[PDB]
Amino acid sequence: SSPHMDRLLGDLKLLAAYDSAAGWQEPKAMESAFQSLSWDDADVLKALPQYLNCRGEQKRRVDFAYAALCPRPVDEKDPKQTLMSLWMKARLFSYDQKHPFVLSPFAA
Amino acid sequence: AASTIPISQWPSLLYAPPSSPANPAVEALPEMQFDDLHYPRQMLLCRGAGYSLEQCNRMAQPDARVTPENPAEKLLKEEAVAAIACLSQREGGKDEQCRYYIERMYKLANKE
Amino acid sequence: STSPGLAFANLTLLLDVPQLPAIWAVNAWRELNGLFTEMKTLAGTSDLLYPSNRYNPQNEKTNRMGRPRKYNHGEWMFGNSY
Amino acid sequence: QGIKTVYASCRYRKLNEREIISDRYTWLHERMLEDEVERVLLEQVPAGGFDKTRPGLLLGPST
Amino acid sequence: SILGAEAFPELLSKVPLNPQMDEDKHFNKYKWGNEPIPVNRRTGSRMNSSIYDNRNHEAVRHPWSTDARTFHPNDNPEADRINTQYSNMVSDSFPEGGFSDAPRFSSNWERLLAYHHGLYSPEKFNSTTKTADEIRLAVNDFAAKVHADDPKNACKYLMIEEFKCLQSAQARIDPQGAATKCVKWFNEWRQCAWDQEKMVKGYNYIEDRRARKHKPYIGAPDLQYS
Amino acid sequence: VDAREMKVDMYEKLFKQAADLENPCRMPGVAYLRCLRDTLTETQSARRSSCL
Amino acid sequence: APHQRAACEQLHSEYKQCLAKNGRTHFSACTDFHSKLRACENMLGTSYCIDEGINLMKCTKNPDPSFCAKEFVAMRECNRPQGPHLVLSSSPSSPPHYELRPEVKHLYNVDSTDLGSAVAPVRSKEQLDRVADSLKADLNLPGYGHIPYKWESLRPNPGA
Ligand SMILES: CCCCCCCCCCCCCCCCCC(=O)OC[C@H](COP(=O)([O-])OCC(O)COP(=O)([O-])OC[C@@H](COC(=O)CCCCCCCCCCCCCCCCC)OC(=O)CCCCCCCCCCCCCCCCC)OC(=O)CCCCCCCCCCCCCCCCC
Ligand SMILES: CCCCCCCCCCCCO[C@@H]1O[C@H](CO)[C@@H](O[C@H]2O[C@H](CO)[C@@H](O)[C@H](O)[C@H]2O)[C@H](O)[C@H]1O
Ligand SMILES: CCCCCCCCCCCCO[C@@H]1O[C@H](CO)[C@@H](O[C@H]2O[C@H](CO)[C@@H](O)[C@H](O)[C@H]2O)[C@H](O)[C@H]1O
Structure with a gap:
């Protein structure tokens, strides 16, 4: 009811656990964490290629939110880290294109 | 083997951390940034220019000075999409079902 | 002649008496550099020269530490700014 | 060494004199530049000087 | 309608977020087990440290009532400290959740008076430790601002280093302890300031002639120094 | 030009003592005074276009 | 008279240019200009630091053991726009004093205008004794002069 x-x-x-x-x-624990990471979400799967080609304001919003949640730069060589980053970004992209983010404290 | 790091050695530990199975980009750790002053500064500058609060909120934009993006997301695009397809189909790659794509990506990125 | 107990003196001699020519040459070079510095000083300089100092880069456009002089673009009624 | 030392004593005396006077001339140069700047700044003072009783900028009400 | 069905994959798949959770819920997915962080290191109160203090190893006294059980640093750590990250290192000198000495004021004027006399700052008392990511973000922002202030400055990285050391030593919550670590870099910056002023404004001195026994031994080399 | 350099140095010293690194106006002020240092050997009319 | 004011400013700039061109060794060439500059001063109420500059230039080539410090400070205080803040008091008394004008007293951290003598003190056993006694009284430390152990000797002060 709150998926x-x-x-x-x-x-x-799961990111924290990894x-x-x-x-x-x-x-063993970190592979369990990788395996349990909600890869079967059709919405995020559909939004992944959209995120990979988005540009401008939407991309900057999603990048800001991702740097909030996970500011550490992952190693460019580790594909598991790269993929989890991509998955989280696609999830945020889906949420943003459904209901955009309002990141400023000033708002009304 | 892994000995204690005293408190005097922590500033070097932050920018040259020990090795892990999931390391960060040590060369890019000085490039990770997230400004807590971005929106306050923007508002202050616009209100000093002479705009109203509504105009400032309409003109506000999120910070581009954040941690840079992984180049793998633009270089290994198709490989990553295929790996994610394999994971979505095979339940996260249990019992070594996405090893093909993951090994291709690892070789492409590492080169021995 | 020699002995094992004289290894200290043998080593010291063999390694140091060949250096004495070089030491005397260094001393002579130092005296000549001092002579030339004093002749230059007698001839005259815009800014002073420190005699017993290693290097003296000061001139009209350069400080006594090798940097450009501050406030040296114009001319001054009392002459040099130093 | 004694001859060299006598000559060096004379030279060092003269050099000390020159160094002191040079440093004082540099000091005077800087102070004269400051005086020029002040002379230019005093032209921007309004006629009658500053109202030292009040604040220059009144930045709020007093109710 | 059940609450939080899809929200506990750590429970569905037996994934522990930490070795303490692993030990508690008996998932047993950590090969090396768990050495529990004891309570005196999980929480506690601020203490005096110097041996030249009479109340050494005693809790700091505040205007408000506070538990006097102290945080005990790790003085005899084990040889193998498998996690040598900042996360596990900081627990040896500070508690991650902050100290247990914070007040709940019955009035606003008590808060005012404590602040006015220098005995309360919320920055200090209602706060946790900073994470390595936070520290790095702060340091990099400060470095950018300093580089913008002046690139052609020699004391730049020294100022950045004192900032870095304060952040790493958690000066928000232990300012006296952190200043004790960082005043060396402040002193180096203080020196660099004069070295730069004397290079900008040409300041030098008449060096004396060479000493008769500058060399201790004739066969020794007299390495020339600027 | 020497007195101009001195005036700009006075401005910079005063403003840097007044505004600390946490201050938001510090970077703009220092940038403007750096532009003045760049453009000392110029007239105000030519300097305005660059420092505006 | 603005015409005359501008003419005199031009004359002063010309004098400075000539003096800079000649240098501070050859300064007796520009005695031309004093004729007109003193008239400028008497007319406009202006000062141009002529005597002070000339005295400084003359002194620095045949310097005093003071190394011309009073000349330097005199020139520095003359060249101020609104006038000298610090001056040297004129006295029948033997020692001269540094004095501060009253209208600029609020700029300086002083109780009075007298900033002390313009020459250092003379060495005296009595003055040293006085200063030491005053410092002892101000400190008020019980423990000064106490000697817990002294080398056993017929001499009162062994060594010193
Ligand atoms: C048997 C051998 C012969 C024995 C006699 C030898 C001693 C002769 C001297 C006797 C006189 C000493 C003075 C006494 C008066 C009180 C003063 C005093 O006591 O202070 C000195 C000293 C304590 O010092 P102090 O407490 O700090 O007091 C203040 C200072 O001393 C003083 O104030 P100061 O610090 O400001 O003075 C500094 C400075 C001021 O003085 C000077 O600067 C100059 C002094 C040197 C003068 C040079 C001579 C002058 C020459 C001029 C002429 C030249 C031309 C002609 C000659 C040419 C030469 C050929 O220098 C001195 O004062 C040095 C003092 C020398 C002390 C005596 C050193 C000898 C120790 C005992 C040796 C024992 C030998 C073995 C015995 C074996 C027996 C079994 O006490 C002693 O010296 C003790 C002497 C005891 C004699 C013992 C005799 C043996 C008896 C057997 C007993 C058995 C039990 C013993 C145990 C073991 C047994 C097996
Ligand atoms: C052919 C030339 C003369 C041949 C004789 C060579 C013998 C010289 C050895 C004497 C010892 C020199 O040792 C040391 O060297 C030089 C002078 O030489 C001096 O050194 C000092 O004064 C000289 C001036 O000449 C400066 O150049 C030098 O920077 C300064 O350090 C020291 O005061 C002296 O103690
Ligand atoms: C009643 C009769 C009285 C007779 C008085 C006799 C006066 C004798 C005075 C001799 C003093 C010479 O003093 C000594 O000389 C040498 C050179 O010669 C100096 O020079 C020596 O040391 C300095 C540096 O230490 C340098 O110049 C150099 O390295 C060396 O040559 C010494 O710095 C000085 O200490």
Whole structure:
């Protein structure tokens, strides 16, 4: 009944778990985290190629939100990290194109 | 083996962290940025120019001075899309079902 | 002649008595550089020269530390700014 | 070495004198430039000077 | 209508967010197990540190009532500290959730008076530790601002280093402890300032002649220094 | 030109003591005074176009 | 008279240019201009630091043990637009004093206008004793002069 919210919070928890398991040297845990990351979402899958070709204001909004949630730059060589980043960005892109973000504190 | 890092060595630990299975881009760690003053500064400048609050909020735009984008998202586009298709079909790559695409990506990025 | 107990003196001699020509040459070069510096000073300079200093880069357009002089674009009634 | 030292003593005395006077001339140069700047600035003062009783900019009500 | 169905994949798939969760829920996906962070390192109060203080290893006294059980730093750590990231290192000197010495004021004038006398700042008392990402963001913004202020300045990276050390040492919550770490870089900046002023404004001195025994031994080399 | 340099140095010293790095107007002020330093050997009419 | 004011400003700039061209060694060439500059001064109420500049130039080539410090400060204070802030008091007393004008007293951190003598003190056992006694009284430290151990000797002060 709240799938978008639920899947968002789950994705964030799984990212945190991946980072912790990497720090603690735990391939089993971090692969479990990678596998449990909501890859079966049709909306995000449809929005992925749209994000990959978007440009301008929408892209800047989504980049701002992604840098808020995950400002660390992932290693350009690690495809698992790259893919989870892409997935999170596609999710945010879907949410933004349904209901755009309002990031300023000044608003009415 | 992994010995304690005293408090005096933490500034070097922040920009030269130890090795992990999931490392960041150490060369780009000085380039990660996120301005908490972006919108306040924008509003201050526009209100000093002479605009109203509504005009400022309509003219406001989000910061471009954030952490740069991964170049892999533009270079390895098709490979990443195929990997994500494989994952969506095969339940996150359980028991080594997206190893093909992941290994192709790894080779392309690393080159021995 | 020699002995194992004289290894200290043997090594020191072999390594140092060949250096004495170079030491005397260094001393002579230093005296000549001092002579030339004093002759230049007697001839005259815009800014002073420190005699016992390694390097003296000061001129009309350069500080005593190798940087450009501040406030040196115009001319001044009392002459040089130094 | 004694001859060299006598000559060096004379030279160092003269050099100390020159260095002191040079530093003081540099000081005077800078101060004269400051005086020129002040002379130019005093032209921008309004006729009758500044109203030192009030604030220059009144930036709010007093109710 | 159940609450939060799709929101606990950590529970559905037995994924632990940390070794403490792994140990608690018995998922057993951490090969190396878990050494629990004890309570004296998970929480506690600010203490005095110097041996030249009479109340050393005693809790700091405040106008308000506060638990006097202190945070104990890790003085005898284990050899293998598998996670050597800042996340696990910071717990040896500060508690991540902040200290337990914060007030809840019954009135606003008490807050005012404490601040006025220098015994309260919310920056200091209602706050957690900063994460490495936050520290890096702050440092990089400050570095950008300093570079914009002046590129042709020699004390630039020294100022950046004192800022970095304060942030890493968590000066928001332990300012005296952090200043104790960062005043060295402040001193180096203080030196660089004069070295730059004396290079800009040409300042030099009459050096004396060479000493008779500048070299201790004739066969020794007299390495020339500027 | 020497007195112009001195005036700009006075402006910079005063403004840098007044505004700290947390201040928002510091960067614009320093940039404007740096442009004045760049354009000392010029007239106000030519300097306006560049420093505006 | 604005015509005359501008003419005199031009004359002063010309004098400065000539003086700079000749240098501070050859300064007796520009005695031409004093004739007119003193008249400018008497007419417009202006000062041009002529005597001070000339005295400084003369002194720095045959310097004093003071190294011409009073000349330097005199020139610096003459060249101010609104007048000298700091001057050297004229006295029948032997030692001269540095004095500060009253109308600029609010710019300086002083209780009075007298900034002390313009020459350093003379060495005196009595003045040293006085200063040391005053400092001891102001400090008021019980423990000064206490000697917990002294080398055993017939001499009162062993060593010193
Ligand atoms: C048997 C051998 C012969 C024994 C006699 C030898 C001693 C002769 C001297 C006797 C006189 C000493 C003075 C006494 C008066 C009180 C003063 C005093 O006590 O202070 C000195 C000293 C304490 O010092 P102090 O507490 O700081 O007091 C203030 C200063 O001392 C003083 O104030 P100051 O610090 O400002 O003065 C500094 C400065 C001022 O003076 C000077 O600067 C100059 C002094 C040198 C003068 C040079 C001579 C002058 C020459 C001029 C002429 C030249 C031309 C002609 C000659 C040419 C030469 C050929 O220098 C001195 O004062 C130096 C003092 C020298 C102390 C004596 C050193 C000898 C120690 C004992 C040696 C024992 C040998 C073995 C014994 C074996 C027996 C079994 O006490 C002693 O020296 C103790 C002497 C005790 C004699 C013991 C005799 C043995 C008896 C057997 C007993 C058995 C038990 C012993 C244990 C082991 C047994 C097995
Ligand atoms: C053919 C030329 C003369 C041949 C004789 C060579 C013998 C000289 C050795 C004497 C010892 C020199 O040792 C040292 O060197 C030079 C002078 O030489 C001096 O050095 C000092 O004064 C000289 C001036 O000449 C400066 O150039 C130098 O920067 C300064 O350090 C020292 O005051 C002296 O102590
Ligand atoms: C009642 C009769 C009284 C008779 C008085 C006799 C006066 C004797 C005075 C000799 C003093 C010479 O003093 C000594 O000389 C040498 C050179 O010669 C100086 O020079 C020496 O040291 C300085 C640096 O330390 C340099 O110049 C150089 O390295 C070296 O040549 C010494 O700095 C000085 O200490």
